[PDB]
Symmetry: D2
Subunit: 462 residues, 4 copies
């Protein structure tokens, strides 16, 4: 046994599952706003020998030895991270060891906040993520609501935008020490200048969790949160189109000048955050992922990525306006980023029903709670994403054809809402009914034909 | 753009770093007990297309759709995890989603404990990991000691073994709710029966952290902690030779019963463990790693793995006895697993000077706090591991000459510890001198030429 | 030494200070809304042999023995407590061991809330007390903000009333587990029905801290909070006119009927609260104070107390309307209880200046932050109280004469605001200036003559 | 109405209870180590007019005005507190505002500690108070163990003394921030030098809870804890024979210094202690109690108090030796302060049966957990105190016959413990029987006739 034999001969059970998943990505219309297709160059670094190195510590501050090469790799990733976002190295440092986006956000809270300290993020049904301190009316869901007392700020349901007025009002009463300026399901631009004004008043840090929009920020196609944020977290996949990991951008330099003393007061983020990632929360970093992050980061500084992110915005608004003409309403009217929020309620269907419909025809979308409905009620909306297909060289009229395939799916589900009463009656009827099964199969085959014709990043085989 | 271009074509700067690290892994004698060289079969699954599937949730209880293929990959990983350790799927469950070993320990704490609940782990200078609630006299280090109240149990300084009697009394006073039977530097077996003894008396949970010895337990060599531990956490690399991920095994079924209780009291660990990983602490799973650990988990059930595993212990005694027969005392006198705990205080050197002179000759080890270290600044001990090199087909005689370079390394470091008083002047002499550099430059060529013969698991170029 | 010799012969230094304080109360116009003059019957029980009994435990559940008489005393106080507030013993129990009002409120939080659990009380500059979880923008002031995470609700400055709308809105976002419905500086009636609607929605307990208005509630001259509150705390002095202590009224019986099961769900307040007072927070109760509380409680159920509390309301509105005619504005227009909130800002003086002015003429009032000013700015208002003078048989035209003495004091301070610039210049000028000293002395003597003519509860001597 | 009517005139039902308790105090032999009969001088100050002054704040830093007389009463109490214990007003301060002893301990914790900080006190079965962080295996009891993390130190079961060596090791593991040298049931002195030994090593505070021995320290009999303890808390009753209140003595001035530190490191306990009492935990001070404890504090400096104090220890040895010379073993073998720790396991009875038979004969004691109690249900030991009866001019021969009734009491309880198996059947036999009732009814008449001769400090009727 040498360990150098291919997976096809070593584990045929898993190598088959690898090809079955690769076919699902090639034949399906991946419409989930958070999903992207990683390039082969990064995946070659993700599954490499760098797995075999315990580089506990930091470049130049390693607990072990033999970290000669991984130091150059970890340092290059930091330089490529700051270069991709046009950050000045004297004003910005970056940690590249967060295992994913969720451990990245908890690292920032652990670094700058005591247990039970207060944070404020957008509510989960309003568009914020779990890691922004989401808790329900019965249970503390995210561990961010357990180790820290979180109060969410909500949207204004009349406009679908963030209620920046109610945020400033409740921040004065709640007195949070950290406010999250980032979303998971939000089709509009976050007013980071308004977030900083609130944070400057209540003496709170401004964290920008740009996971969904990091690629657009790196391409400078949307306003960059670094102009106002103190700490900036992001996943390394999604719009960045890299391996699953996370980054933590922090301000280094001088915070401000002393008022009555006239003295430069420094920033104390680097050593607090770098200590929170290790040895507080994590252990040995995944140098294979760090390298893969660096490969995708190098791709972000290229005119290729500027054109790709630009096409994402064009595809998203092309998908938005196409949805509007067919009779669909959208949260906040349309989109200014990479995703659109469809409101299926004025069309007679809920997101939980339509997502199962689209899932059976290889169209992976996700239900979304629309502004107004009290969360627990079956979500009457969907969240659609552009970066996934755009990575496969999708065009505007290609996304317009995507909307056509959704219009057929919604109508198929609409005919089942009349033939059924409950959601599980809806789910089972889609599989057991004779006529409804073949029309789902016909739409699926027509979807898979159109989807397979486009390219696909990564390996041909897996 | 395509995304299917090679790494050597698109990013040459990163491709050279990949080979420089692979050549460094081949040219050296990796002796860190936590390191291991993963197989190519898992590296093909690690850098696969599964990085592009947000499968948040659990099989059958997914948050999205299109999780058709990733579900059976997680369930095959769950089945292979219980099968490798010979666990009844009716008595044991597993979570295959923890990003690494450190997130696996934080998850079970959040699952079964409240903030500031009492935990007890082995002290880091005594051989415990950070994740076991390592607290200092100066500061809180691990987040396990920040979000939870931790009191460490120590070793017997005269025997070098865990002071089970001191633990038995301090537990009745500290009144912990969970005790960790983990090990990062302890060359003998842990009386899991005596730890269930203490955990049942103080009514606490017994969690086994077999991350360092997990393949030795999978190969049914050393006794298995699953007889006693209610919960078992593990890293997927180290002894199992897999990708970097984590596992959380938990007892499920029936705890006890009583005719007074009416029926049976069930094990309620499953839902708590799973909820703690997602949606509490983590988010989107790294199913590309889950696939790679499923690959290595199937390898763990093979007759080859037990053959490889037994050689690790045989090389452990080979390294221990050869070190003993050269003027080196060992903590607890020898080894009984995969690692060896040297004591360099007799030889005349310390751990910090030795791990640097040995790292400068492609023999990577690590510092270790030995029982009786009169100084915390510079510890007098290393820790050398068998699993790393044994994966390159290392017999007992192969390890018996790796200690020859070691003994030559410490003697070189001994002939400068007198020439140079302080460590920072020590470290500066190994490269500013014309003689000591030649002394080390010639040692590692015979060291790299000896290492390069054995084949390296994984790819050839990277 | 027998210990039975009087204080006059034993400690002449303290017996003189006793008579000097008694003269200050007899000669001064005690206008502090929280102050009252305890009767001699209660003071005879406050300074009695009951001090010498350690009655740790509860009637029938004593840790010691010999509690035969103090059990009858503690039980009679409970019966007189429930009788004074027209409470049904099957619906209401009461704890009589809180040392004061502040330890009473912390007992309720400790009983029903975990550490760092959330509460909501009126902000301190808005009228709420410290024990309602007051914290500043720099420091956690009250220990209620340390052991529990408190968010305050504020008044509506346009009307001076409690912002019941903003309270309901922020309660949904903050999700508190206990809401305080009680004030220290608030001249209007609390809408307990609206408080219960908010608490019923966010699944929170409704605590009514009726310390300032307990006597008015016992006389049934204002709406009783027991109609809506779950737990009711109160000091035993103030409007109750008793010895310094506290009570905790809790609902006993059935909370509600099971919705889907049809079953009576009990109240679990008694044993949680009684355990929080002892042995959690306190030790041996002050049986001398408990007895004194019972003496004053017996007086509360009498037609005398109904007439006294009625005269308090008449005196307060007589003081209010008198203040209005002289050109003074009042927060929320006037008063519906025992105190008025004067706004001195439209008259050219602040409360910090006027209170020092009135203090030098034996008129003890307190400055009050008026709705609008950002707390730290020198308070431009005063809080005036009726129960203190009304206990001395003050009439409406007597309080109208009280307002005349305040009008002279304000005008004396107004002439110093022009002659000074800072607040300490104001304070020192009142004492060192020749002309300003005699006019303060003339007003003081005229105040002390008019004040000494009225009766005074308690002993003649001390 | 007037308010100056007598208690016997207005409330006769309460006046009869006052005499029934006073007659019970006179007719019995109070032997509880925590009880004491306060002097009339302090009872006149306790039930004085100072109950009617909200003096929130501190002298010179009051929140209101009119605090002219109450300020010098608090400062005289502060001066008398330092003078009684011979404390330099430059090295020691005092807070005379804690409502009782239990609030005094909670205040200093809030002053110097954060929530869930580590504290260490004597276990309650070993002789520690609740306020020392008493935690059980089943539940958290004292709020000191809820709001703070507590680990108890134990006694040596073979010696009956504090296990200073077990404390010395568990402290290095628990890493506490404050250790309490308090005692509720421990008849020997505490090595405060050896506790400063441990507190200086683990860098923790040393707080002395001399509540039980405070007058013995004031009379300069037993050694004073003020030599070592950084902070000292105390109850104003018990050994000092004062009203029920609390005191918090704190070291102020200069901690240490260094030529490297430039100047001197000052003691920063004063502002933390004072702020914790008000405005953190308490509110309006009970200056009527503060006056009464100032009365008894002046008595503590008299040559009479030292004469009274010495008799307490002389009566302690008298009670201990007489008990030893009658077939009673004592914990640690005798006494060296004010209390005695009997061990009734040799005699044949237990604490629960003995404290009831003795309470039924006007000899009030208390249960006590003796080292080696094979059952927690029924402890085998009482605790009898000298300070209570010594305040009635009890010589050594007077106490030597109080044990005669005790020995007669335990023998009566011994002759029924065989007649009645279970305790609830035991307790029922002392009143349902015609013989045992006569056995006890005749014993207490000789017991009450013996007690009634000695005069009672305080008033005559109440
Ligand atoms: N805008 C936004 N869109 C998305 C899309 C995906 N995500 C990631 C988070 C997905 C998620 C959210 C909530 C729960 C959850 O609470 N599950 C409990 C319910 C129990 C109870 O609530 O009582 C259960 O499974 O039982 C689980 C997973 C986000 C996000 O974070 N934000
Ligand atoms: N037996 C055992 N062996 C090993 C081998 C590797 N590891 C994992 C890493 C161990 C480790 C311990 C401490 C720190 C650290 O950061 N220490 C400084 C703070 C830094 C500063 O700012 O100077 C401090 O303590 O102050 C980092 C890593 C283990 C383990 O956990 N256990
Ligand atoms: N409506 C209302 N009226 C009254 C009237 C009396 N009280 C009782 C409470 C009085 C009180 C309030 C606040 C502080 C305080 O904070 N002092 C710090 C400031 C430090 C900082 O804020 O940074 C210091 O002394 O330095 C102290 C005492 C109340 C009440 O509770 N409510
Ligand atoms: N050495 C020492 N001697 C004495 C003498 C008096 N005291 C002060 C009071 C001691 C005390 C201890 C325990 C409880 C208690 O409430 N126990 C139950 C819960 C009740 C239930 O619900 O059954 C439980 O533990 O479960 C109450 C009081 C002390 C002291 O503190 N120390
Ligand atoms: C390897 C290991 C871990 C996990 O470390 P990571 O760097 O997070 O993979 C935890 N505990 C012990 C004892 C270990 O050996
Ligand atoms: C996508 C996203 C995440 C996901 O974090 P993972 O650790 O990758 O699951 C978290 N937060 C926000 C705001 C996101 O947009
Ligand atoms: C008396 C005493 C206290 C205070 O008890 P209270 O009932 O609150 O007065 C605290 N600790 C010890 C050791 C005591 O002896
Ligand atoms: C008067 C008042 C208090 C005072 O409590 P004390 O313990 O007596 O100082 C507390 N809370 C409220 C709401 C009050 O009105």
């Amino acid at each position: 046994w040498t360990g150098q034999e291919s997976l096809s001969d070593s584990d045929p059970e898993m190598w088959e599952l690898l090809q079955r998943e690769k076919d699902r990505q090639c034949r399906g219309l991946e419409l989930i706003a958070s999903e992207n297709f990683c390039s082969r160059a990064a995946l070659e670094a993700l599954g490499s020998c760098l797995n075999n190195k315990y580089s506990e510590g930091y470049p130049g501050k390693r607990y072990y030895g033999g970290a000669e090469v991984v130091d150059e790799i970890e340092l290059l990733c930091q330089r490529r991270a700051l270069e991709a976002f046009d950050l000045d190295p004297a004003q910005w440092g970056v940690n590249v060891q967060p295992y994913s986006g969720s451990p990245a956000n908890l690292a920032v809270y652990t670094a700058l906040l005591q247990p039970h300290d207060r944070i404020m993020g957008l509510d989960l049904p309003d568009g914020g993520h779990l890691t922004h301190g989401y808790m329900s009316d019965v249970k503390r869901i995210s561990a961010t609501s357990i180790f820290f007392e979180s109060m969410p700020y909500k949207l204004n349901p009349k406009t679908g935008l963030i209620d920046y007025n109610q945020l400033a009002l409740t921040a004065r009463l709640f007195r949070p020490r950290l406010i999250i300026a980032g979303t998971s399901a939000y089709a509009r631009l976050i007013d980071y200048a308004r977030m900083r004004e609130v944070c400057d008043e209540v003496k709170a840090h401004l964290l920008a969790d740009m996971a969904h929009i990091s690629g657009l920020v790196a391409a400078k196609v949307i306003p960059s949160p670094f102009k106002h944020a103190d700490i900036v977290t992001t996943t390394t996949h999604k719009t960045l189109r890299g391996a699953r990991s996370g980054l933590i951008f922090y301000r280094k330099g001088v915070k401000a000048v002393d008022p009555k003393t006239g003295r430069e007061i420094p920033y104390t983020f680097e050593d607090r955050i770098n200590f929170a990632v290790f040895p507080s929360l994590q252990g040995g970093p995944h140098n294979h992922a760090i390298a893969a992050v660096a490969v995708a980061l190098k791709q972000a500084c290229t005119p290729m990525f500027r054109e790709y992110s630009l096409q994402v915005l064009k595809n998203a608004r092309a998908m938005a306006d196409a949805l509007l003409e067919r009779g669909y309403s959208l949260v906040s009217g349309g989109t200014d980023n990479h995703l659109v929020l469809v409101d299926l309620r004025p069309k007679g269907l809920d997101g939980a029903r339509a997502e199962r419909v689209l899932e059976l025809v290889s169209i992976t979308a996700n239900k979304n709670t629309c502004p107004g409905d009290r969360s627990a009620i079956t979500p009457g909306g969907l969240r659609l994403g552009a970066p996934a297909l755009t990575s496969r060289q999708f065009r505007e009229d290609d996304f317009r054809r995507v909307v056509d395939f959704i219009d057929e799916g919604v109508n198929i589900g609409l005919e089942v809402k009349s033939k059924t009463a409950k959601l599980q009656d809806f789910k089972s009827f889609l599989l057991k009914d004779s006529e409804t099964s073949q029309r789902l199969a016909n739409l699926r085959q027509r979807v898979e034909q159109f989807a397979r014709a486009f390219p696909m990043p990564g390996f041909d085989e897996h």
